Amino acid sequence: SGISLDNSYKMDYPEMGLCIIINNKNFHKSTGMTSRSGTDVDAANLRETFRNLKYEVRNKNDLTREEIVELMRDVSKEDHSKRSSFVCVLLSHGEEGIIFGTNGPVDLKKITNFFRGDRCRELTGKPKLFIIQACRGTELDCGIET
Amino acid sequence: HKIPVEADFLYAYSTAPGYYSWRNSKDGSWFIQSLCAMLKQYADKLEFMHILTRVNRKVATEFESFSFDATFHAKKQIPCIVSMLTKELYFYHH
């Protein structure tokens, strides 16, 4: 062969990979968390957008904290050998480092740890993309005139 | 011969650390709206970090909150790209 360069992730595996969309709109009354009006628009937009990128999209709605962790555990143990990448989109309430299931919070580190290079060997070396629409606190940006 | 276990993650946060993130009940969230628009327009053209930078600009420039509550009115948002990737990422190939 001629000269080769290795600056780009290999993205021509047979499949682009999974796109898991977790769309938490309605929360258990006991949590005191408000419904997230407009999130279904987001979830549908993402489904179509990643469909056109050739991702195998799975939309999941209103998952408890236990369901979120089990879904991440199960998905990380699937066969990813034919997949280029992994995408997970989280739509929920949150604070810094935290995303909410319908009944309570999940540490973001808990979710992503399932895909660590040593714990998910069939994603080692492959890009793992987490897209997070959630609060990170309660500060407000007042902006500045241009 | 080894890679860090934290390598090859990308966290595309909707907002800066410590900040609220804004969602519109009719249009969807500012960040996801803008992310999908920029993916649709640039996924066959730009590397992913450059797409996400266009998302940063769209959210920063085109959105401003409207609220009857002075505390929450006229506010802005910047998303936050957190990259532990080790290569460029293009959604297209060949």
């Binding site: 949150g94 609060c135 | 804004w22 969602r23 519109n24």
Partner: peptide, 4 residues
């Protein structure tokens, strides 16, 4: 407009 609402916060998350």
């Amino acid at each position: 407009d609402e916060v998350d």
